[model samples]
Target: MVGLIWAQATSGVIGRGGDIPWRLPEDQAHFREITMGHTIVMGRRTWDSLPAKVRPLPGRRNVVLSRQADFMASGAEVVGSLEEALTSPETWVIGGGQVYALALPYATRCEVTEVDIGLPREAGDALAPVLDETWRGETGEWRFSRSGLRYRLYSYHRS
Candidate 1:
């Protein structure tokens, strides 16, 4: 199950200032539910953005992608690229923009939250390399609302 998971705004923004800009508790819970006990691959910036106490999110194998050969993160595996991380039987590409874009091509499934708002103009790193038409699904396909946000838990499978 090579899957990519992320929450993106209508404007295609996933993050800013090294962290998610919005506070959606329900989305956070949803993320934890799907990722726990799974091998999650993320970029070095994502790992660093995490709070110090949970640098390597517990109960999951944390793999950080970094080109720097000597980048050391406690309790996590540091790899050079997405190819190396995909060797795991079941992998989840948990983000920071770059990692998500890199892993999208290899992803068989995408679990995404379609947020209604858009990031501000100053927000950096909008989620790029948007999924194209080869992927199929939409708003009414598999929808769910939480925290007064009408977001959908889209399970986009490549046709």
Candidate 2:
């Protein structure tokens, strides 16, 4: 099964300046909890966004989608296309705008967090793919951060 996991602002933005514009430790924990032991497919820029010390997120098999035939990361499997990554038994299409857009059509499910606030334009926010009529979403009750921000977990299934 293919799953796409990401957190985005109210504006459908998932990234900005090659990084996540918001920092919510709780969200990070949520990400780790769901993707553990799963194969995650990401673009090179997404891999680069990781802290240098943790280039490949631990506990998950990292599959990087890169066009360069020689591209490689010490702990990741490099694939030329999203289709190659989808062949895994269970995979999560993790982000960086381009990869998410490419993998959306093949996703069986989308596990996302919706933040209440929209990101600033200067952050260079990158938009996530839209969930159209073919998908159905179920959202949980509101979650609040210590900083007074609101968010919620939403799971979408393709119908």
Candidate 3:
């Protein structure tokens, strides 16, 4: 199963300035729960955005996609193209921006955490993938995090 998972703000922004713009522990737990045993594929920038300690996220296979010939991801396989990463029968594209766009067409499932907060725009903002007519979405119930933020997990599948 090819899947893409992310948390986005109301602004349609998934990230800003190389970091997720908000703090919600609930979303973190949800992410871990959904992706724990799956193969995760991401771009170079996405790997860089993850904290050093958790570089190769535990309990899963990590595949980092980068066009740079010299790029190397320690403890993770670095592939120059999405095709290389897609060799796995079950892989999830966890993204930064460009990679999401490239992987969307091939994705069979999408797990999106929708946050109500809006973030200020940055020159490096990374937006979430668009779920157009080709994809069908099932809306999840909105709930409040213990941290006081409201978020909902939405599931989608490409037609």
Candidate 4:
């Protein structure tokens, strides 16, 4: 099984939300490259954060984690547990904090987008979990520039 994690940070590490602050082209390209043919899992909050017409993320099967029996997201399957989300052949643990934490333990591979930006301590909404020496894995970093921000995409594979 394979899993992917993705996010974008500001120069100061802000949670670039909405159209104005978000660089959609770069984000979409990265997402398309990694998740085009795989199933994706995210929290209900992340699903609600996207545009209605573009929900479910086009070509991928989207599964949203939610506890509520009535939690509704157009073009998404509501799941109550991580075990259910892992039933797919290939899954990407896409996030907004809560979902990331839930899937981290089961993830064999994690890919993060490292954005270089200077900011105060309280810049972003969430911080990624630290990888320990026990997680002997390989990393691949690809650098690129977008909207004046220099960023690198990182992939970590657990061995």
* Top TM-score model: 3
Error of 1 at 84 (Å): 1.0
lDDT (Cα, tens digit) per residue for candidate 1, span 37-108: 999999999898899998788899999999999999898999998898887778889997899889988988
lDDT of every model, 2 decimals: 0.81, 0.87, 0.87, 0.70
lDDT of 4 by residue, 35-131 (tens): 8888999878778777878787988988898998898777888988878878878899887666777787787887777665553335445445555
**Candidate 4 clash figure, as a count:** 2
Where does candidate 1 clash, by residue pair?
Answer: none
TM-score of each: 0.88, 0.93, 0.95, 0.83
**lDDT (tens digit, per residue) of candidate 2 on 35-154:** 899999999989989997886899999999999999987789999988887777889888978998898888889998988885744445677889899989998889998757899999
Order of models, best lDDT first: 3, 2, 1, 4
Candidates 2 and 4, the one with greater TM-score: 2
Off by over 4 Å in 4: 8-24, 121-124, 136-142
Q: Clashing residue pairs in candidate 3, if any?
A: none
**What is the alpha-carbon RMSD of candidate 2 to the true structure?**
1.6
- Give me the runs in candidate 3 sitting further than 4 Å from their true place: 120-122
Off by over 4 Å in 1: 121-123, 138-148
Candidate 1 clash figure, as a count: 0
Question: What are the RMSD figures for all models against the true structure?
Answer: 2.3, 1.6, 1.2, 3.0
Measured by TM-score, how close is model 4 to the native structure? 0.83
